[PDB]
């Protein structure tokens, strides 16, 4: 149906179909079986033009999937700096956490995304945030030998 095809188009980077399907009656916040919205999928797969189109058309910047993950979590993990900046400007919750109490900064730290780590820090990201296993962004940057990030995370 329209919602499924919009989720598929957003994942696949099909910007015309994204625009057409919403005009035809697809909910901009259609859900897949994991509770992903089109914005979640566009944010993870790096489709900035589609992220922008969805936000313009009323996408929930802070939508949570069935595991409590937000588009900002996915963009930070996946290292999409331009998307992370566009989500933060649109009011993305900088310290969103789920059970696992894992924040976007945790994921950027782990995957070695320096510039995203800095941008999150600049929007008041919590360096003191512990996951369910008492690990902080700092702990994950060490465990992964990400030295520059571990450094910048002490620096605050």
């Amino acid at each position: 149906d329209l919602g499924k095809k919009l989720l598929e188009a957003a994942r696949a980077g099909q910007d015309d179909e994204v625009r057409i399907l919403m005009a035809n009656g697809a909910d901009v916040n259609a859900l897949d079986s994991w509770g992903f919205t089109p914005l979640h999928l566009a944010a993870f797969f790096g489709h900035l033009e589609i992220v922008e189109v969805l936000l313009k058309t009323g996408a929930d910047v802070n939508a949570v999937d069935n595991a409590g993950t937000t588009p900002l979590h996915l963009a930070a993990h996946a290292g999409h700096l331009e998307i992370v900046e566009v989500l933060l400007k649109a009011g993305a919750d900088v310290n969103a956490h789920d059970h696992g109490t894992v924040t976007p900064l945790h994921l950027a730290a782990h995957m070695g995304h320096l510039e995203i780590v800095e941008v999150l820090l600049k929007h008041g990201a919590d360096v003191n945030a512990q996951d369910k296993f008492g690990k902080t962004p700092f702990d994950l940057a060490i465990d992964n030998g990400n030295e520059d990030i571990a450094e910048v995370l002490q620096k605050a």
């Binding site: 994991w34 993950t69 993990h77 059970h99």
Partner: protein, 61 residues
């Protein structure tokens, strides 16, 4: 696949993702039927193992 990133995020062990992707397991579907024994074979630390297993059982019906 974002489902695997999101799953492990929800459970508190995003640092566990490479134990799955190093075997070419990319999505939550690829994990659904792993055993307790299988999670040990993947060399997931006991800190995290049973948390991951219970999470996978919670997805079943």
């Amino acid at each position: 696949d974002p489902s695997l990133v999101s799953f492990l995020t929800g459970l508190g062990c995003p640092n566990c993702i490479e134990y799955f992707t190093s075997q070419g397991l990319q999505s939550i579907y690829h994990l659904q039927n792993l055993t307790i024994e299988d999670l040990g074979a993947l060399k997931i630390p006991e800190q995290y193992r049973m948390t991951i297993w219970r999470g996978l059982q919670d997805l079943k019906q």
